[PDB]
UniProtKB/Swiss-Prot annotation, chains A, B:
Purpose: Calcium/calmodulin-dependent protein kinase that operates in the calcium-triggered CaMKK-CaMK1 signaling cascade and, upon calcium influx, activates CREB-dependent gene transcription, regulates calcium-mediated granulocyte function and respiratory burst and promotes basal dendritic growth of hippocampal neurons. In neutrophil cells, required for cytokine-induced proliferative responses and activation of the respiratory burst. Activates the transcription factor CREB1 in hippocampal neuron nuclei. May play a role in apoptosis of erythroleukemia cells.
Span of the entire protein shown here: 12 to 301 of 385
Protein kinase domain: residues covered: 12-243
Family as reported in the entry's similarity comment: Belongs to the protein kinase superfamily. CAMK Ser/Thr protein kinase family. CaMK subfamily.
Chain residue numbers at which the record places covalent cross-link Glycyl lysine isopeptide (Lys-Gly) (interchain with G-Cter in SUMO2): 102
Originating species: Homo sapiens
Record's protein name: Calcium/calmodulin-dependent protein kinase type 1D
Keyword annotations from UniProtKB, A to Z: Allosteric enzyme, ATP-binding, Calcium, Calmodulin-binding, Cytoplasm, Inflammatory response, Isopeptide bond, Kinase, Neurogenesis, Nucleotide-binding, Nucleus, Phosphoprotein, Serine/threonine-protein kinase, Transferase, Ubl conjugation
Length: 265, 265
């Protein structure tokens, strides 16, 4: 299930660097035998010392499973001292860029995005994976298509008060993302910030929140809940009317949200 | 995520019946708009009364996930009184037919089959699904290819002593399947049979088991373990040398296994 290589460069022509992380890089790569483009995560083995097997079990299991809202692992290569995760390259661009570029953007659009993230994270949780790093940077659109889905592209403010813990920390992160999706700025924002987060002290301030539904605000409260016990799970969040029902509004909130994204990020 | 239809027959031409179950049928079907063949499971809604949502949640989640060793759910249609699960049609045929037809069959072949079933069932367990009905009839080859994988094709001797319970019942079933794969006959076989199962009384009888490895027998013992606590999980079984290592033998055991399948089934 792992392909072996004496030298990865016999298989891929590496191109531009797409991302860099703690102790890995993600690079764009052409498969020399086929032309096909991929995103390849490059990981030195010595960085995984100890929990090498455990992290090669997340990978061994995930290799066999394709989730609609997570970039698929097409292949794993092993050399003497590295693992290479060969991933489906997406073509739809970054989350905020997309929202800024839209002419029209509603709560229904935000709800659809969150629904997809909930589905992906529910799956990861079921598999015993706590993502711990859900944030906009790690969400990419699949394609340029108007109807493109969003996908978790990568694994390693958004951190749960208990951290500052269990799978519930991810659900907090999703709540923060939802907050940003509906107003264009983060719910917290240096010691007073740290203080705010640890007391889950945030507001739906005017004028930015005035045109947002009660249902959306309730949804966010239930995820951005200090008590990780009372906090909605992904399963609970997915049943909420804002996600599963028809309470998400159809008002164009693009002007304000985009203004705030531009100004705030 | 569910397509709605006033009449399913506007979408599919139904052909031969592929399977029948408790209160559903699986039928071969041509998509009229495209020609493409599928396997369609047809389910009256009233059969799911009560746990309708719950069973529509197994489906709602699974729709988004493709496992290499489970037939994929391509689409779900809903009419006023039925659900239709539209599945990827396989082309590789039934498990025993394939083994009888081979000229050469080894423990390594059996191990590869079990590895795949372990992977599928591990995933189902992680999702909170207990299959409860794992048996050869529910395993089909993907293609005619020599290297074809096996796939769970369907959901609803092989039943765990505790039943005669938890996800562990599936692991018992896999042990029974492994037993049959290595000798061509069931480990139990009417009141004395019921008695045997409830005491996990079985043997690796000569001459059929003489050419089988100790490693294979140990593997089977660990799954066909009366105590569901001590019983190997799918995760444990997948780490066993017979599956993960190189203890599976390379001896052609086809003559005997096929003889016994033919005679016994
Ligand atoms: N530009 C990127 N594209 N794709 N495509 C698949 C996976 C990724 C990815 C992962 C991490 C960082 C950047 C990217
Ligand atoms: N970009 C990814 N990075 N890492 N890092 C470890 C495991 C994974 C992974 C698995 C599936 C899809 C994407 C990725
Ligand atoms: N002959 C069959 N073929 N395929 N292909 C996909 C799923 C199934 C299936 C399920 C149940 C019963 C028979 C079959
Ligand atoms: N043949 C199947 N039958 N049923 N019945 C309920 C759920 C499913 C299912 C899901 C995925 C793949 C195959 C099937």
């Amino acid at each position: 299930w792992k392909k072996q290589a004496e030298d990865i460069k016999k298989i891929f022509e590496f191109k531009e660097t797409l991302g860099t992380g703690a102790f890995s890089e993600v690079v764009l790569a052409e498969e020399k035998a086929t032309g096909k483009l991929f995103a390849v995560k490059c990981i030195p083995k010595k960085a995984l010392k100890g929990k090498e097997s455990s992290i090669e079990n997340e990978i061994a299991v995930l290799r066999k499973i394709k989730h609609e809202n997570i970039v698929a692992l097409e292949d794993i290569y092993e050399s003497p001292n590295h693992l290479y995760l060969v991933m489906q390259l997406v073509s739809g661009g970054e989350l905020f860029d997309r929202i800024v570029e839209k002419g029209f953007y509603t709560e229904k659009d935000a709800s659809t995005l969150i629904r997809q993230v909930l589905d992906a994270v529910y799956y990861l949780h079921r598999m015993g994976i706590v993502h711990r790093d859900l944030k906009p940077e790690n969400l990419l659109y699949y394609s340029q298509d108007e109807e493109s889905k969003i996908m978790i592209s990568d694994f390693g403010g958004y951190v749960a008060p208990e951290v500052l813990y269990s799978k519930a920390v991810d659900c907090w992160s999703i709540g923060v993302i939802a907050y940003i999706l509906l107003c264009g700025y983060p719910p917290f924002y240096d010691s007073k910030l740290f203080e705010q987060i640890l007391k889950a002290e945030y507001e739906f301030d005017s004028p930015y929140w005035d045109d947002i539904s009660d249902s959306a605000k309730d949804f966010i409260r239930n995820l951005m809940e200090k008590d990780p016990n009372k906090r909605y799970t992904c399963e609970q969040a997915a049943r909420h009317p804002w996600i599963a029902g028809d309470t998400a509004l159809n008002k164009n909130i693009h002007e304000s949200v985009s203004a705030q994204i531009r100004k705030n990020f």
